[PDB]
Amino acid sequence: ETLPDVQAGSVVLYRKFEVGEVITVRPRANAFDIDLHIKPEYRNLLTSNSVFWAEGGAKVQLNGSGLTVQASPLSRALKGAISFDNLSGASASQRKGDKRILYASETAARAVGGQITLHAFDAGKLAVGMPIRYLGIDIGQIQTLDLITARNEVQAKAVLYPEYVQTFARGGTRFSVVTPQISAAGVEHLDTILQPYINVEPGRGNPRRDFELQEATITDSRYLDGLSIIVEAPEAGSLGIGTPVLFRGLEVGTVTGMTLGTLSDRVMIAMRISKRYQHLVRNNSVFWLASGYSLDFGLTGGVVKTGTFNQFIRGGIAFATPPGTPLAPKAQEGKHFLLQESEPKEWREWGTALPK
Amino acid sequence: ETLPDVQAGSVVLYRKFEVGEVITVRPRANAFDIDLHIKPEYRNLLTSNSVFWAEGGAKVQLNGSGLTVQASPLSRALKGAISFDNLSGASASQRKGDKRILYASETAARAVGGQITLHAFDAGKLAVGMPIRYLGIDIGQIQTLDLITARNEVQAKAVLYPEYVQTFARGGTRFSVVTPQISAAGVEHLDTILQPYINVEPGRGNPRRDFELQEATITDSRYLDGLSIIVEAPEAGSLGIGTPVLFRGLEVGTVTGMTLGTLSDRVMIAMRISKRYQHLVRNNSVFWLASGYSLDFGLTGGVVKTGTFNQFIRGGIAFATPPGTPLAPKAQEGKHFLLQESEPKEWREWGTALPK
């Protein structure tokens, strides 16, 4: 439909190596036609599962560290060239249209079946070419941004590479942007300042391939595949997303999210505890809010303490198990706990034996 | 009228592809004339709704990430070239003038009907080429800046792309710049430091196409299409634009603006509450000011708390609903509330059942 780069007389590439030749840009009223010459032995090597992608001009290929340019003839440097390669499931590209379609780049030539669609309310963080990462590994990329004013949202259509298209996009898949934060909570992300990406949690179910871009989550990356615990509290307090959960001062997990209840009388606080520390919680495991500095004034003599701990900056939930010679069973995947407003004196003196 | 780029002998482009040739720069005393050659089949393809835009020299096309240059002949690299394309409603460009007019760039060639005019008091943030964005999507651009000293203001004439010219500029459309902030309130905008833009709220009414650039608003972007609530207070206090409104500690909305009353005895504070949290407020929903740290000294023993919460930095309004077995109806689009100077003791013990 469009040929911005294509110039007549340019060279055909294969694995960034020259075999073949572009000869003709034959125009039509609705959709322009391009004609290519390749050798008779290699046209027998040509497959019906072949994709053609074009690139034009000279890219300096900056990319931070290395901006080298490859061994290039004057035929790319003067005229917009075309490369090609085979792949496994490219038969659908020949099912559609009358003839093969020339994709605008190598990324769009891999966009057969792996093309998904997101729905975001604010595209202020999104960008064209923004990579979708899983565990810091590039597994996808946004290629366009469509604004709709009929329903006031932005449809972001992205791609997934064909190795990960089956494992991901299975429904219940949470797409979340990462972003620089400057607030009451300290910043943990520095590469996102220069180059932001999208973290993703996989799911299980039906291949939906229609998604909603969720909010910026912090808990999910470091504390993953853990026991989900819901605790109901009268007040929010200094709690937030990223607030650590502490066991004898050791950070075992963090708060996933905060939501109003089904009845608006208690806020529910979702947390996850790590797998190695999952066994610590029991059905008798009382929570208490440990936020900020708590110190007791003294009349005869005044003892004061400034720990400069993390709970002052983000106010954490701390717990311990009361001693019982019959042990209560483990906490369920869904179970509600009652937070204690005061820190119980006894927890220093409990000494609860938790094996393994 | 002006031809800075045009050079005789240059090439005619179409979709960044060469067909045709510029032959003559024929001068006149008042307005210079340019003559173009195109092929006989393509001049039949030429339409009365065609726009011509010219670009000269070689642009490195830096643009942050990619600074590649396209496949270009020496005819652009030596001489200022001319491209063209059709569009739908370009008949007005041929109604004006004797012959077709050559626009200075591709953006000015799309500026037919979509050209609006702003009135700003200070053009210290504005710039030529500054994009007008809606939900982070580029939907417009400032192209010139005109200073008037008869009335001491700056007229900024901008463009809108023809897809969004009908949906936007409908009257009641609020144009507001975004800007880096370094003040008592924490900074949320980091891309604006490098590249500032203009956020816009659409409106409903008559196609005015004459606007006033409003002040830098913070509430509008994140908290949008919500229930507007006016609260009158004796004092301003630590309130400001961006100050959150809290329900049981959860941020449900923010303060839109602050204005003196019709009678200067009470300041009015405009806020919006989000759609999912809109049902929480009722006709009996008392406000109170929760700003800074409030702690009670103890004579026998002194309890102190430092939450390190957001309300210390920007002093928020918190509320809860008193319990009533007949429920009062929802808050109106315009209704005045009375802020309580002291936090009522009872709100912890209210336990008001708010469904859905």
Nearest CA to A254 out of A243, A239, A269, A238 is that of A243
Contacts of B302 in chain A (CB under 8 A): 296-297
B293 touches chain A (CB under 8 A): no
Contacts of B225 in chain A (CB under 8 A): 152
Tokens of B104: 């200075």
Instruction: Give the span between the Cα atoms of A278 and A253, in whole angstroms.
Output: 9
Nearest CA to B273 out of B239, B215, B222 is that of B222
B281 and B298, same domain (yes or no): yes
User: What's this structure's resolution in Å?
Assistant: 3.5
Strand extents, DSSP E, chain B: 11-14, 18-26, 33-37, 50-55, 81-86, 102-103, 115-120, 131-134, 137-148, 153-160, 174-177, 198-201, 211-214, 227-233, 244-247, 250-260, 267-273, 286-290, 316-320, 336-340
Tokens of A201: 């949690």
CB B110 within 8 A of CB B162: yes
B224 and B337, same domain (yes or no): yes
Q: Cβ A126–B136 below 8 Å, yes or no?
A: yes
Instruction: Provide the 3-class DSSP secondary structure of residue B252.
Output: strand
Answer with the one of A56, A89, A112 that is the final residue of a domain.
Answer: A112
A152 and A244, same domain (yes or no): no
Distance to chain B for A39, nearest Cα, Å: 25
B87 and B5, same domain (yes or no): yes
Q: Which structural domain, as residue segments, surrounds residue A4? A: 1-112
Distance to chain A for B205, nearest Cα, Å: 16
CB A201 within 8 A of CB A272: no
From residue A326, alpha-carbon distances to A284, A329, A350, A353, B8 in Å are 11, 9, 15, 11, 96
From residue B320, alpha-carbon distances to A235, A238, B240, B347 in Å are 11, 18, 21, 7
Answer with the one of B60, B92, B112 that is the final residue of a domain.
Answer: B112
Answer with the one of B75, B94, B112 that is the final residue of a domain.
Answer: B112
B181 and B196, same domain (yes or no): yes
Contacts of A234 in chain B (CB under 8 A): 248, 348
B316 and B260, same domain (yes or no): yes
Most distant CA atoms of chain A, gap in Å: 101
B166 touches chain A (CB under 8 A): no
B234 and B354, same domain (yes or no): yes
Nearest CA in chain B to A75: B71
Contacts of A1 in chain B (CB under 8 A): none
Solved with: cryo-EM
Count of structural domains, chain B: 3
A231 and A102, same domain (yes or no): no
B76 and B93, same domain (yes or no): yes
B92 and B10, same domain (yes or no): yes
Distance to chain A for B247, nearest Cα, Å: 9
Length of chain A: 356
Residue B78 host element (H or E):
helix B74-78
Encode burial over A199-215: b for 16+ CB neighbours within 10 A, e otherwise: bbbeeeeeeebebebee
SS3 sequence of chain A:
CCCCCECCCCEEEECCCEEEEEEEEECCCCCCEEEEECCHHHHHHCCCCEEEEEECCECCCCCCCCCCCCCCCHHHHHCEEEEEEECCCCHHHHHCCCCCCEECCHHHHCCCCCEEEEEECCCCCCCCCCEEEECCEEEEEEEEEEEECCCCEEEEEEEECCCCCCCCCCCCCEEEECCCCCCCCCCCCCHHHHCCCEEEECCCCCCCCCEEEECCCCHHHHCCCCEEEEEEECCCCCCCCCCEEEECCEEEEEEEEEEECCCCCCEEEEEEECCCCHHHCCCCCEEEEECCCCCCCCCCCCCCCCCCCHHHHCCEEEEECCCCCCCCCCCCCCCEEEEECCCCHHHHHCCCCCCC
Instruction: Give the span between the Cα atoms of A350 and A324, in whole angstroms.
Output: 10
The bridge status of strand B211-214 relative to strand B174-177 is parallel
B3 and B95, same domain (yes or no): yes
Phi first, then psi, for residue A318 (nearest 5°) are -115, 150
B298 and B213, same domain (yes or no): no
The bridge status of strand B153-160 relative to strand B81-86 is unpaired
The bridge status of strand A131-134 relative to strand B244-247 is unpaired
Encode burial over A113-146: b for 16+ CB neighbours within 10 A, e otherwise: bbbbebebebbbbbbeebbbbbeeeebbbbbebe
Encode burial over B177-191: b for 16+ CB neighbours within 10 A, e otherwise: bbeeeeeeeeebbeb
